[PDB]
Amino acid sequence: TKNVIRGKYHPEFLQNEVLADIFAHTAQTLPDKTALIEADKTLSYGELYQQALIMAQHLALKGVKPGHIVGLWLPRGIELLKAQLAICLSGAAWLPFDMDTPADRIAVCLEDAEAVGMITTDEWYEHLAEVPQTKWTNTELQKPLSESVSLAKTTPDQPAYIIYTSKPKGIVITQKNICHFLRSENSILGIQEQDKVYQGFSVAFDMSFEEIWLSYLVGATLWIAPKSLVSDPERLCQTLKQEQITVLHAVPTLLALFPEDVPNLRIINLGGEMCPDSLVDRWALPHHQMFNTYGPTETTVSASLELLERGKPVTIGKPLPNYGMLVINSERELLEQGETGELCIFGPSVAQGYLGRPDLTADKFIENPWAMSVEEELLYRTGDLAKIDEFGQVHCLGRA
Ligand SMILES: N[C@@H](CCCC[NH3+])C(=O)O
Structure with missing residues (x-):
């Protein structure tokens, strides 16, 4: 009633699917198309699929099952994405680590998540002497197999990945959460199979999902940035032109540091x-479709999206399809449109909660008295203060 704002109604974005389904569909539908470009090395979707499958079978032999958590720590490049996809194909969820993560933080996170292990490279294996968990190298996980290994299937209720934010706080995103987010956001972004997507984010950040998995969803080609390029905005501007990139996911301060336009x-x-x-x-x-996406990690990557246009005021925009937002008071009561309160998000992409933190989880993932469907029964309290304006638009106002 003007005080509950919903994205477009799209039940078809909720399917009986897991991330392995989405990727396998793309690889089987477009085997010979290039998926990954690292410098002058290229990998096809079919190549990527078979290699990741061999790795996943090795993980299975070593005891990785659906519902397990496997840490991921490799340098930006093909092997990193390959290993992510291998964890995914084994039916486990991954715990991504940035290149710059200290070994002690890796140990704290693997312990907090009760991970069965992590994947890394031969080189970085020695930096992890402080890690008691099992460490596998991508290399050993890539050796030939004598007989095929059957992979147990995961389900939508199972975790797809765990994101840590510091005492470390792990956010459990389900297969259902992320598969829905991918369909819901791409229905508006519309990344296409012909697109060439810059891949510059560390796998430890939400926007890596928009770079990688949206592309995987439609079979776009990913150009994987080297560590040295990520901190060189002018060189990146020239790289984006020379590589004929068509899709940039980025942060505003990075875009501002580009000297020229990139047509x-x-x-x-x-x-x-x-x-x-x-x-x-x-x-x-005109020749750019410039978007602004907002949302906490606790609701899978993004919760609202806004088309930016010269001269139009900037806002977080309307919720993504099947997402919803409302505003509540200090005692969890719905507020009339126009008042200021805490912004709450609901929908099928609300995360499962904080790993091993029933306390904070119950504090921040509360029941929604106002759910009009079973996919709306969980409200996540963002902690932001907001108001709904006379046009059904949400305005952010800072923390509470
Ligand atoms: N979700 C990121 C920033 C917003 C990204 C939106 N595409 C974070 O919470 O740190």
Whole structure:
């Protein structure tokens, strides 16, 4: 009633599926298309699938089953994504670690998650003497097999990945959460099979999912950035032109540091900070579709998306399809439109909660007295203060 704002109604984005289903569909439908480009090395979707499958079978032999958590720590490049996909194909969920993660934090996170192990490279294996958990190398997980190993299937209720944010706090995202997010957001972004997608985010960040898994969803080609390029905005601008990139997921401060426009960019998805007006004016051109995505990690990558246009005020926009937002008071009561309260998010992509933290989970994932379907019974309290304006639009106002 103007005080509960919903994204478009799209029940077809909820399927009886897991991430392995989405990727396998793409690889079997487009075997010979290039999936991954690292420098001058390229891997096809079919190649990627068979290699990741061999790795997943090795994980199975070593005891990885659906519902397990496997840590991921490798340098940016093909092997890193390959290993992510191998964990996924084994039916386990992955716990991603940035290149710059200290070994002690790795140990704290693997312990907190009760992970059965982690994947890393021969080189980095020695940095992990402090890690008591099992460490596998991608290399050993890539050796030939004598007889095939049958992979147990995971289910939508099972975790797809665990994101840590610091006492470390692990956020459990389910297969259902992430598969729905991918379909819901791509229905608006519309990444296409012909697209060439820059892959610059560390796997430890939400926007890596928009770079990688949206592409996997439609069979786009990923160009994987080296560590040295990620901190060189002018060189990156020239790289994006020379590599004929069409899709940039990035943060506003990075876009602002580009000297020239990059004409070949179909889609520009800015997340993290609300895009400033000067940047919109500089970039919200006709040959660019410039977007602003907002959302906590606790509701799978993004919860709202906004089309940016020169001269139009910037807001977080409307919820994604099947997402919903409302505002509540200090005692969890729905507020009339226009008042200021805590922004709450609901829908099929609300995370399962905080790993091993029933306390904080119950504090922040509460029952929704106002759910109009079984996919709306869980409200996540963002902690942000917000108001719903006279146009059904949510306005952020800072923390509570
Ligand atoms: N979700 C990220 C920033 C927003 C990304 C939106 N595509 C975070 O919570 O740190």
